Every structure is written in structure tokens, then in C-alpha cells.
């Protein structure tokens, strides 16, 4: 039986990177988290105030509360069969915004603009996407010169 002991098997999890100990750089501090925003979690060793438990490290989850020093945030997390989603409070250093939540807010600008413009002249503007379709025929022009005869190579010992 292993131990219970909140920071167990975090020997390399809450560490710092090589040539990155020391002072907390200051931009980290000064970016406004709003309610709703989607966010991803990653403990930091430098500040022992405000950590999440080792299980939520790695995950992702939207915000529901803002105060002086923290944010309250909703994640999912398994357990045996079922999925309990749950409210955990964390200090700001152990957090970034979520970064596949702004490739959607700039294609929605491209999708809104080209169904109001391109309508008054007369063309249908396909905004839906399709996964890589199967390629079609093409010519391959030799230019006087030719291909190469790759015979394979005979064994030799090398030690």
C-alpha cells in the first residue's frame, strides 16, 4: 500500500524547468480573467500558496467566480464509473486562459462576414469544412534526364 500524502508522486510535477527558477515574471500577474472564460491548469512550485491537487494538473475548465486573488473554476474528473464535475478554487499563478477557445472566435468572424458580403452579386459561400479529400490525377514531366536505379546494399560488420 502506498501512502496518502497530498504531494505524493509530484517529484517532477511541481518542479521548475532547467534555467527557470527564481522570480515570477510579471505579465502572469496582470491579465484579467473574466467569468466564463475557458482555462487550463498547471501547478507551479514557486508559490506554495494556492495550488490545485495533483489530479487536476493537466486538465481544463471554465470559470464561475472572481475575487481579489483567485478564481473559482469548474472542471470534469472521472472516479470509478461516473463523472463528477466540481468546483475548485485556485490562485492565479497556476492557470492560463484556454487556447483552442480563440481559433473559434476568428473563424466565426470569417463565417459571419462572407454570408452578408458576396450575396448581393450572386454566389453561394461554403462555410462548412471537409477533412482532407482524396487527391486527383497529375502529370510528372521528366526533363531530358531520368530516374535512378536503387539497388540495395550488401552487408558488412561495423564494430
Amino acid at each position: 500500500t502506498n501512502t496518502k500524502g497530498k504531494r505524493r508522486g509530484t517529484r517532477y510535477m511541481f518542479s521548475r524547468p532547467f534555467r527557470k527558477h527564481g522570480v515570477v515574471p510579471l505579465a502572469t500577474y496582470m491579465r484579467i480573467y473574466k467569468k466564463g472564460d475557458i482555462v487550463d491548469i498547471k501547478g507551479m512550485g514557486t508559490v506554495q500558496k494556492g495550488m490545485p491537487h495533483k489530479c487536476y494538473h493537466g486538465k481544463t475548465g471554465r470559470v464561475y467566480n472572481v475575487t481579489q486573488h483567485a478564481v473559482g473554476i469548474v472542471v470534469n474528473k472521472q472516479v470509478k464509473g461516473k463523472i463528477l464535475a466540481k468546483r475548485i478554487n485556485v490562485r492565479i499563478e497556476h492557470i492560463k486562459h484556454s487556447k483552442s477557445r480563440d481559433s473559434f472566435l476568428k473563424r466565426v468572424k470569417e463565417n459571419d462576414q462572407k454570408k452578408k458580403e458576396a450575396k448581393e452579386k450572386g454566389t453561394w459561400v461554403q462555410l462548412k469544412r471537409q477533412p482532407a479529400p482524396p487527391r486527383e490525377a497529375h502529370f510528372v514531366r521528366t526533363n531530358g534526364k531520368e530516374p535512378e536505379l536503387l539497388e540495395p546494399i550488401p552487408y558488412e560488420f561495423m564494430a
Binding site: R19, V23, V24, L26, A27, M30, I32, V66
Partner: protein, 293 residues
């Protein structure tokens, strides 16, 4: 021999500190407590008053910090007192007070807050604080960045706080550092604080030296004799300089002068040319070797 300390290893593992520490100016510990804002206020910027006192002069900016990097809403320096009838006295406790009052009356000139909040016209020399009225725009509530200035009961950085509050700002402050405060008896003196602001602490050292002998009067108060600044027009003059700040606060600049277009500093030598420098050094060592032998 001794081991060498700084060998290949040493550098491989090195972590340099931030730039502004290597240079040696910013103190991050305090900055971090100073610059930032409590999340449940969002953007609603925090405000400071920077003060610095250079060798020959004084500087007074005001700022709030953005992520891209902090922004100076307004600056009134101590090299512009040449334009308010002040020929000398540009580094001193008395001229920390004018460069603090220039900043306040210039910032209240820039947002439509001229008539609201006057502060003080008479220099009394005691604890003062700015209220907020009904049905009018409110007061400024910034803080004091002190830099790396040992903060002791007598220091010109505090001269610049008291300059801005008497103009019309609501900065939180204390009289435990303002000159005159007897730290032994524990009461705050009024008219020893007033003697240092107008500039009669510099007046004692003209009559003390000249009555003793004419030797140390020469190197010390030399540009005082040069511009005609006697001890009689010492308090006659520093009551004139606090009226032109109130009358004419707004800033006026020079035009951008025409460019000759010439090179002073050296450009970075080229890949080719650095290679040009290592087939002539190698070759000319080996010709003079056959010349020597």
C-alpha cells in the same frame, strides 16, 4: 594549482537575472506589491507617482501598468524651472516641492479639473488631506513609488509627495518622515517643516560662511553670486515661483530640428569581412616565419 571556478560547466548551468536587475534599478519585490490590481476590479487601472532624484536634478512621472509595458500619463520634470523665475536651486528639498506641484497642477490642467480642487495657496507646513464633494468630479488617489531611496525622516522624495497633495491630490501619507518631526518627544512640528520648503535652510549657509571668512563662500555659493541671488531675495523669490505654476501650468515644447544625416557610431562588421580578417593573419604569420628563418 587551485581548481578553476568559472569553467565550461559554470556557464552551462548559469541563470542570468532579469535585465533591469543586472543594470540595477528596479526592485521587483516591491514593484509586484506596487504595480498590480485585485482581480475583482478588472482593468480599472492602479495609479502611482514615480519620483527620482538624479545627481543634478529631479524627475516626476505618473503611471499605470499594462502588459505591453507601463504608460506615462504625465510628467513634469525639474529642468523646466528655468521658465518660472528660478535661476538656481534645482536638486534640493525646496525644488522637490515645485516639481511635485508642477506635476499636480499640470495633470489637473489635462482632464478638465482646473477649478475643482485647489489644494493650498499659503504654505503652512502641516498634515493636509483632500476631500470629495457632491455633484462634481472626484479626486486622484495614486500611491508613492520611492525607488531605492532609504526612507528617512529627511529626504527629498518626500518633498515631492507634499508638492502634489497641496496642488490637489488625495495621496495617503505620514508626518513621521517630514522634516521637523521630533522622533524623541513624538510630536509633529509645523514651522520647522515650513522652513525647509520655501528655502531658508540654504539661506543660513550664505551668512554663516561670509561672516566667518571669504574662502568657502567662493566654491560653494558661486552660481549664486554669478546670477545675483542674495540672502535678501531668498523668500522674496520662492513666493513668485508657486504663482506661475497656478497661473500657467500647461506644457510647451520645441520643434523637431532638421537632420544633417551622418554616421557617428560604428556598424557591425560582416561575415564576409570577418572571413577577410582570417586568411591575412594566418598567411602573414607564415611569410614572416620564412623571412625570420
Amino acid at each position: 594549482f587551485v581548481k578553476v571556478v568559472k569553467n565550461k560547466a559554470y556557464f552551462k548551468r548559469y541563470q542570468v537575472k532579469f535585465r533591469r536587475r543586472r543594470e540595477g534599478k528596479t526592485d521587483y519585490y516591491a514593484r509586484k506589491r506596487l504595480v498590480i490590481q485585485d482581480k475583482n476590479k478588472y482593468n480599472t487601472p492602479k495609479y502611482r507617482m514615480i519620483v527620482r532624484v538624479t545627481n543634478r536634478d529631479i524627475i516626476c512621472q505618473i503611471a499605470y501598468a499594462r502588459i505591453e509595458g507601463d504608460m506615462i500619463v504625465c510628467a513634469a520634470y525639474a529642468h523646466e524651472l528655468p521658465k518660472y523665475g528660478v535661476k538656481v536651486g534645482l536638486t534640493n528639498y525646496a525644488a522637490a516641492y515645485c516639481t511635485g506641484l508642477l506635476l499636480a497642477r499640470r495633470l489637473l490642467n489635462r482632464f478638465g479639473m482646473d477649478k475643482i480642487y485647489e489644494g493650498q495657496v499659503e504654505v503652512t507646513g502641516d498634515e493636509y488631506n483632500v476631500e470629495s464633494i457632491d455633484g462634481q468630479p472626484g479626486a486622484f488617489t495614486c500611491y508613492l513609488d520611492a525607488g531605492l531611496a532609504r526612507t528617512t525622516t529627511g529626504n527629498k522624495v518626500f518633498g515631492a509627495l507634499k508638492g502634489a497633495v497641496d496642488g490637489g491630490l488625495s495621496i495617503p501619507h505620514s508626518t513621521k518622515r517630514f522634516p521637523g518631526y521630533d522622533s524623541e518627544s513624538k510630536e509633529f512640528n509645523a514651522e520647522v517643516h515650513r522652513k525647509h520648503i520655501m528655502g531658508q535652510n540654504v539661506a543660513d549657509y550664505m551668512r554663516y560662511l561670509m561672516e566667518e571668512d571669504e574662502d568657502a563662500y567662493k566654491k560653494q555659493f558661486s552660481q549664486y553670486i554669478k546670477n545675483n541671488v542674495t540672502p535678501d531675495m531668498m523668500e522674496e523669490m520662492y513666493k513668485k515661483a508657486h504663482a506661475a505654476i497656478r497661473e500657467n501650468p500647461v506644457y510647451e515644447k520645441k520643434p523637431k530640428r532638421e537632420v544633417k544625416k551622418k554616421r557617428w557610431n560604428r556598424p557591425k562588421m560582416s561575415l564576409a569581412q570577418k572571413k577577410d580578417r582570417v586568411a591575412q593573419k594566418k598567411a602573414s604569420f607564415l611569410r614572416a616565419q620564412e623571412r625570420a628563418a
